[PDB]
């Protein structure tokens, strides 16, 4: 008898949910010709399960920030993630041509940190639009963009006619409702921002009108180039808020991650989402995935897909294969198929776990 | 054979530490006459261990906020707490005679929440003085006090000579060094605060000069009585900060909980700290003590001490008795003395845990 920790994602019972991308997007097949499921790492037998929310070409972070939006939606006791690759150093995203992808990688890590931590204590994740009211005559403006990627959360509001510089103070009202908690971005350009001969230091506050909490960020960088849009990811309660800009452009949330249905602490499972080695990936989801709230799974091999080089890999297919059955014990080291005896002590475990005793 | 979960605090190996009060203060005995150890729930055999930091009449919260200060100091992999009673509804603390003990109970809960969460990931806790510089000629003033309890953290700075009201903006610089992280209070009077015929709305911000993060609290209550000093407990990095007051009195930290030596996630153990039923206690440490970061232990009986009615209880002596030996498995349900087989599945477990399988 053998009960080793196994390198899979699985589930204790039927109460689970997976968020993903093309590699687990059953619907994508309609856009293959001829129709072919080999682009998937997920087993197509799971296509009717109702336990998957995935979109080819997307990721939760990508949908959070950009106009390229998929309404990821799901509920379960155990949450599993196999997405992230659709925002990587490969995309070379920066708000401006003299920006920094490293900043955006930092943003990515901070975002997934909050997602993973919160999905260990909430059953349900979806996206909600955040309504806001701005009183001026200025409209929103797409200041942050690169190729096909256009930032739309937070929104930037243009300067009013009457102002000749960016030293002004303006505000908008944004209202959070419908969820137990909300993940929203609070961001600034952290750097010396040149506009019409003057260098600015972006400043943005959010204010909960009823709790009275102020969350703010002021620019502190002294560099005049190679800077970008630094974001923090706030986990906020329902309420009515002001977004108060003290310098540069007013920014306000337009989308939130909607967290609902508090649950007993249940660690999430995260699968490394990367490209074939020919493309630059990042380890930000690994950084974000820590005990006790998350188990991280990765293959030992290069991603080499059979459909194309970036889709349908033996290693990741193996990892996802655990979704085809129930497993009793989840641990840092892997999943144990039996709940009785093992040769190693499971670490940070969840479920019915074996003893490594005599 | 029998391996039930047991209602004790214990330790996996010798790497542990206990924070407490008189009920575990070996030194107190010098202040008994004749000398008598029966005031303790801790076994005196542990008096030479070097693994206890306790002071009769004190608590970590009490020392955090008030002039009645004990420098709680300790390091261990597994941290245990048996303190809190020395700040309870019994003490009837309020900043003013028309204040609110309920507010202070809320403060207590919020504080212990941060302590317990952080001591699951740091080995070391102590107190550090927080130096600050205020530029005015005004001195500190003890605005919040009740009987023998006098608040000294945060400090209040009096108004300057030149000001005739409390609508002013002033600041101090405070510097955090020597620790990985710091717990500091950010507080305001949350209410309509009457001074010389005018009603004020307290406002206080802290600003990290290098990260550029602003943490602020503004008063939102409309009541003119029955309000008090609402605190939030920030977990901050080393750095140089400004305390920026926008209304009422400037407040600034004078003491921090010093968190050092990051460790692998290890749940803390907390023992209910209460008075005999003749006195009003509270459940704020229970509220603060949640999975997966904390296990809470409580006796099933009234606290009835043998030394006096509030010292030396059979139930709590029993709970602490587990410190006299090593135990392999810690769980929500209790401590299992054996790592092999049990009849229940340990929940949120830490250590070498038994299987409830056939
Ligand atoms: C954060 O940045 C804002 C905007 O720069 C600061 O507010 C401005 O501060 C300068 C003083 O250096 C004044 O000249 C402006 O009038 C202020 N603008 C406002 C209030 O809209 C703000 O003080 C910074 N917050 C801090 C340091 O906590
Ligand atoms: C938090 O409270 C402060 C102090 O009341 C507010 O700052 C004052 O706001 C009033 C406007 O209602 C002005 O009359 C004062 O001049 C301001 N004092 C200052 C800036 O020192 C502040 O706006 C509040 N913060 C919010 C609402 O985010
Ligand atoms: C109009 O040309 C410039 C300028 O020098 O003013 C070029 C300037 O480009 C620079 C400095 O590399 C751009 N600022 C930034 C940080 O990208 C700056 C801004 O895009 C532009 O001023 C609008 O700024 C705001 C705050 O909306 O535009
Ligand atoms: C001087 O008498 C009074 C006053 O009406 O002004 C009584 C006043 O007592 C009240 C309103 O119950 C006190 N304010 C509060 C909230 O306790 C108030 C303050 O203690 C005093 O004004 C000092 O206030 C500040 C901000 O230092 O003092
Ligand atoms: C996403 O889908 C959920 C479920 O249908 C819905 O409640 C929510 O409003 C949607 N969010 C959008 C479209 O932003
Ligand atoms: C992520 O990558 C950096 C190197 O770029 C490394 O320092 C860090 O340890 C990595 N973290 C994880 C969790 O793999
Ligand atoms: C995943 O494993 C592959 C192959 O060992 C390795 O190249 C890669 O760095 C790992 N990814 C992370 C995020 O650790
Ligand atoms: C599906 O794609 C795989 C991998 O490219 C290929 O071997 C196979 O011919 C395809 N099947 C069909 C029916 O096109
Ligand atoms: C462990 O469980 C497996 C599967 O039921 C079984 O083959 C083996 O005998 C068990 N070992 C025990 C109970 O010691
Ligand atoms: C508390 O004790 C520790 C250890 O001796 C010391 O480093 C620290 O400065 C003390 N804190 C005080 C006295 O505020
Ligand atoms: C604390 O006491 C209140 C009643 O005052 C109760 O609602 C709450 O559930 C209690 N919490 C715990 C953890 O015992
Ligand atoms: C501890 O147990 C006692 C006796 O059952 C009970 O009265 C008390 O409410 C409990 N305390 C907490 C914080 O639950
Ligand atoms: C210690 O106190 C206990 C409980 O009050 C009492 O029974 C005993 O007489 C005391 N012992 C001494 C030596 O005073
Ligand atoms: C459990 O361990 C105890 C103590 O060693 C022993 O008495 C008992 O036989 C063990 N049961 C097993 C190994 O099934
Ligand atoms: K801004
Ligand atoms: K203040």
Swiss-Prot record, chains A, B:
Record's catalysed reaction(s): N-acetyl-9-O-acetylneuraminate + H2O = N-acetylneuraminate + acetate + H(+); N-acetyl-4-O-acetylneuraminate + H2O = N-acetylneuraminate + acetate + H(+)
One GO BP: fusion of virus membrane with host plasma membrane
Top enzyme category: hydrolase
Topology in the lipid bilayer: Single-pass type I membrane protein
Renumbered residue ranges of the record's region Esterase domain 2: 249-358
Chain residue ranges for the region called Esterase domain 1: 1-109
Swiss-Prot/TrEMBL keywords: Disulfide bond, Glycoprotein, Hemagglutinin, Host cell membrane, Host membrane, Hydrolase, Membrane, Signal, Transmembrane, Transmembrane helix, Viral envelope protein, Virion
Glycosylation sites: 36, 71, 135, 218, 283, 298, 340
PTM comment text: N-glycosylated in the host RER.
Molecular function as annotated in GO: host cell surface receptor binding; identical protein binding; protein homodimerization activity; sialate 4-O-acetylesterase activity; sialate 9-O-acetylesterase activity; sialate O-acetylesterase activity; signaling receptor binding
Compartments where found: Virion membrane; Host cell membrane
Active site: 22 (nucleophile), 308 (charge relay system), 311 (charge relay system)
GO cellular component: host cell plasma membrane; membrane; viral envelope; virion membrane
Disulfide bridges in this chain: 26-47, 95-144, 179-258, 187-231, 289-294, 329-353
Enzyme Commission number, as recorded: 3.1.1.53
Region (Receptor binding): 110-248
Virion surface side: 1-358
Record's subunit section: Homodimer; disulfide-linked. Forms a complex with the M protein in the pre-Golgi. Associates then with S-M complex to form a ternary complex S-M-HE.
Annotated function: Structural protein that makes short spikes at the surface of the virus. Contains receptor binding and receptor-destroying activities. Mediates de-O-acetylation of N-acetyl-4-O-acetylneuraminic acid, which is probably the receptor determinant recognized by the virus on the surface of erythrocytes and susceptible cells. This receptor-destroying activity is important for virus release as it probably helps preventing self-aggregation and ensures the efficient spread of the progeny virus from cell to cell.
Family stated for the protein in its record: Belongs to the influenza type C/coronaviruses hemagglutinin-esterase family.
Protein name as annotated: Hemagglutinin-esterase
Lineage: Viruses, Riboviria, Orthornavirae, Pisuviricota, Pisoniviricetes
Full-length numbering of the shown residues: 19 to 376 of 424
